[PDB]
C-alpha cells in the first residue's frame, strides 16, 4: 500500500487549470503525461502522487478509495450521484454550465419530448422539476449532432462560449445549473490522512480566494 496521498485528475482541461493550485501547494508534476503512456505519476512532494483518468472515472476512483482525493466537474458529480465522497472546495475552475439546447428557431414538438444526453439522471431530474414529461436516450459524446439527425428534440450538455452549439446549428434554451470543478475527498481518507490533507487543502483554499 501507498502511505501518502493519491490525487485523481483528468487529462486536458482539468490537469492544465489545476497546475497553478498544485504548484502553490508544493505538488508539481515531474513529467508531462502527454509524452507518456503511464497513467500514474510522481510529484515534487514524495507523499503525493497523481492519477490521470477520464473525467467520468474521477468520482468512482475517489469514491472507492483508489484515490484519496480528486478534482471533478460538478456536472459529473451530479450525474454520478455520489453520496459517498466529501465535496470540500469549489475550485472555481473549468467553469461552464449544464443546459438544454434544440435546433436554431425550431418549435417544440407538441408531444412527449425526446432528450438526447450524456447526463441522463440530471436530464430526468431537471425536466421533472419543471412541468415536463420526457423520454431520454443515453449517448456518450458529440451531443450537438443529435437534434440535427432526428435523434432528439433537445439535448442536455455543458456549454461555455456556445461555439459548439452554434457551429452545429443549435441554440441554448433553458439553464439547468452552473458547473465548476470541485475538490472531492474519500471519506475514509479524510479521517485517516487528515494530517497529510489539511496543509494541501488550505493551499487550495488560499489559491482560490
Amino acid at each position: 500500500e501507498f502511505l501518502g496521498l493519491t490525487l485523481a485528475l483528468s487529462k486536458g482541461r482539468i490537469l492544465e487549470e489545476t497546475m497553478p493550485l498544485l504548484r502553490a501547494a508544493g505538488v508539481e508534476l515531474l513529467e508531462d503525461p502527454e509524452a507518456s503512456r503511464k497513467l500514474i505519476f510522481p510529484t515534487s512532494n514524495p507523499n503525493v502522487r497523481v492519477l490521470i483518468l477520464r473525467a467520468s472515472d474521477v468520482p468512482t476512483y475517489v469514491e472507492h478509495g483508489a484515490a484519496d482525493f480528486g478534482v471533478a466537474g460538478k456536472d459529473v458529480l451530479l450525474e454520478h450521484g455520489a453520496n459517498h465522497v466529501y465535496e470540500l472546495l469549489d475550485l472555481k475552475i473549468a467553469q461552464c454550465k449544464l443546459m438544454t439546447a434544440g435546433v436554431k428557431d425550431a418549435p417544440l414538438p407538441n408531444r412527449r419530448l425526446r432528450i438526447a444526453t450524456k447526463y441522463v439522471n440530471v436530464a430526468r431530474a431537471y425536466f421533472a422539476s419543471q412541468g415536463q414529461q420526457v423520454d431520454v436516450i443515453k449517448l456518450y459524446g458529440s451531443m450537438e449532432l443529435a437534434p440535427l439527425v432526428g435523434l432528439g428534440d433537445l439535448i442536455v450538455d455543458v456549454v461555455d462560449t456556445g461555439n459548439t452549439l452554434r457551429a452545429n446549428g443549435l441554440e441554448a434554451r433553458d439553464h439547468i445549473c452552473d458547473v465548476s470543478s470541485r475538490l472531492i475527498v474519500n471519506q475514509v481518507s479524510y479521517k485517516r490522512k487528515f494530517a497529510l490533507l489539511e496543509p494541501i487543502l488550505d493551499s487550495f483554499k488560499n489559491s482560490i480566494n
Binding site: 472507492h64 453520496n83 472546495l89 474519500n186 475514509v188 479521517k191 485517516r192
Partner: protein, 376 residues
C-alpha cells in the same frame, strides 16, 4: 451460477471462518458475555421494531403459513438481542454475545456480500461510559488476538451534539433532513449558504468544518450551545473515549460529529472501525435505548482476507501397506491415527490406490513394523 454478492466460503477459508467465529465467540464468553443463538426468522413486528427504512429494505419478507403473518429473514441480529433482553435481562446489568448469518436484499458496498456472518456483543442496563470502555477493550483484545497485519482505524461520533443543536435551533424536519444530507456529502460550500439562513446556523457549519478537532469544538460553538448540559457531556465523552483508545490501545482515532446515519436509532455515542482503506466499516457500534444499551457487531467473513492460519498438516495413509495388514495391525494403526487426529493432523484413509488429498504434506508409511510420518 450464484447470485451477485452471494459466494461460497470454501475449503481453507471455510476452516478459517469456523476457527475465527469460534475463537472470537469463546473470548466473548470468557469476558462474561452470555452467548445467544436467536433464529434466522421471526415475525416482522419484533424483527423490524424501530427499524430504519434502510434496514427494512435489506430484510426479505415471507409468510408464516400457520398464521398468515409477515415474517422476515433477519438482516441484523441486534433487534433480536433487544427482544431477548426484554424477556430475560431483568433491571440490572446484562451482557450478550452472538454470531450468526444475516441476509440482505442488496449488497451493502462495492463487491459486498448479501450473506455476511454477523458477530457482536452488547451491554444492557448501564448508564456509565464505563460500559462503552469495556466493549472497546473486549473488541480490541479480540482484534489483537487475530495477529493481523492490516490496521483498524476508529471513527468516533455522537448524535447528541447535532440532536441538541437541532432542538435548540428549533429546526423543522425539512431543515434537519437537508443538513444531514449535506453532512453525509460534506458539501461545505452549500452548507455555508444554507447556514446563513438557519437559527444557530454557524453552529451547524462549525460541526462540519471543525468537528474533527474535538479538543476545541466546545470553544468554537455559540454561547447557547456552550451552556447546554447535554452537548457538554457528549463532547466530554468523546474526549474520554478518544483518550482511552489512544493510551490503552495505541489507536489512531478520528472524530466526526456529523456522522448521523442511525439518527433515529443511536441515542448517543457512535463507533465505526475501518480496516485499511475499505469504505464499509468492518465494525459498527454505539449507544441506544427506558433501558440503557450499548454494543457492536462485525462481519466475520471480512476478517478472512486479513487473517491467516498455520498451514494444516495433511496426512495420507499408504493404501497398499494398509490393505496387507491383518485385523490386529489395523486396530493398532487406527489407534495411532486416532492419536494423530486428536493432535489436529488431518488423516485420510484412502479408498483406492489413487486417493490423493488436496495439499498433501505427509505420508504415514510402513517400515520395520513401524508406521511413521515422512514429508512428501
Amino acid at each position: 451460477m450464484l447470485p451477485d454478492g452471494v459466494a461460497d466460503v470454501l475449503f481453507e477459508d471455510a476452516h478459517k471462518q469456523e476457527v475465527l467465529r469460534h475463537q472470537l465467540t469463546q473470548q466473548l464468553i470468557t469476558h462474561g458475555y452470555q452467548l445467544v443463538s436467536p433464529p434466522m426468522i421471526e415475525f416482522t413486528e419484533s424483527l423490524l421494531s424501530g427499524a430504519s427504512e434502510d434496514l427494512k429494505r435489506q430484510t426479505f419478507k415471507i409468510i408464516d403459513q400457520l398464521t398468515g403473518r409477515l415474517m422476515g429473514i433477519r438482516a441484523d441480529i441486534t433487534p433480536q438481542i433487544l427482544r431477548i433482553d426484554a424477556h430475560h435481562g431483568g433491571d440490572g446489568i446484562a451482557r450478550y454475545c452472538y454470531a450468526g448469518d444475516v441476509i440482505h436484499t442488496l449488497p451493502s458496498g462495492l463487491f459486498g456480500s448479501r450473506t455476511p456472518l454477523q458477530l457482536g456483543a452488547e451491554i444492557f442496563g448501564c448508564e456509565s461510559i464505563a460500559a462503552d470502555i469495556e466493549l472497546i477493550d473486549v473488541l480490541f483484545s479480540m482484534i489483537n488476538s487475530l495477529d493481523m497485519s492490516a490496521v483498524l482505524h476508529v471513527d468516533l461520533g455522537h448524535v447528541t451534539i447535532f440532536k441538541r443543536l437541532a432542538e435548540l435551533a428549533a429546526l423543522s424536519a425539512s431543515d434537519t433532513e437537508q443538513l444531514m444530507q449535506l453532512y453525509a456529502n460534506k458539501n461545505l460550500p452549500e452548507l455555508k449558504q444554507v447556514c446563513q439562513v438557519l437559527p444557530m446556523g454557524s453552529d451547524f457549519y462549525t460541526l462540519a468544518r471543525f468537528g474533527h478537532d474535538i479538543a476545541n469544538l466546545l470553544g468554537r460553538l455559540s454561547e447557547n450551545a456552550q451552556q447546554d448540559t447535554k452537548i457538554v457531556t457528549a463532547i466530554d465523552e468523546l474526549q474520554r473515549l478518544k483518550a482511552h483508545l489512544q493510551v490503552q490501545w495505541q489507536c489512531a482515532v478520528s472524530i466526526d460529529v456529523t456522522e448521523l446515519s442511525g439518527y433515529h436509532y443511536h441515542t448517543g455515542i457512535v463507533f465505526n472501525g475501518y480496516i485499511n482503506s475499505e469504505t464499509q466499516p468492518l465494525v459498527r457500534g454505539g449507544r441506544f435505548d427506558p433501558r440503557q444499551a450499548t454494543g457492536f457487531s462485525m462481519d466475520v467473513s471480512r476478517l478472512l482476507a486479513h487473517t491467516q492460519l498455520d498451514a494444516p498438516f495433511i496426512v495420507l495413509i499408504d493404501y497398499d501397506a494398509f490393505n496387507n495388514l491383518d485385523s490386529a495391525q489395523r486396530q493398532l494403526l487406527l489407534q495411532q491415527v486416532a492419536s494423530l487426529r486428536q493432535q489436529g493432523y488431518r488423516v485420510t484413509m484412502p479408498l483406492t490406490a489413487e486417493d490423493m488429498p488436496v495439499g498433501l504434506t505427509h505420508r504415514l508409511s510402513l517400515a520395520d513394523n513401524q508406521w511413521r510420518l515422512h514429508a512428501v
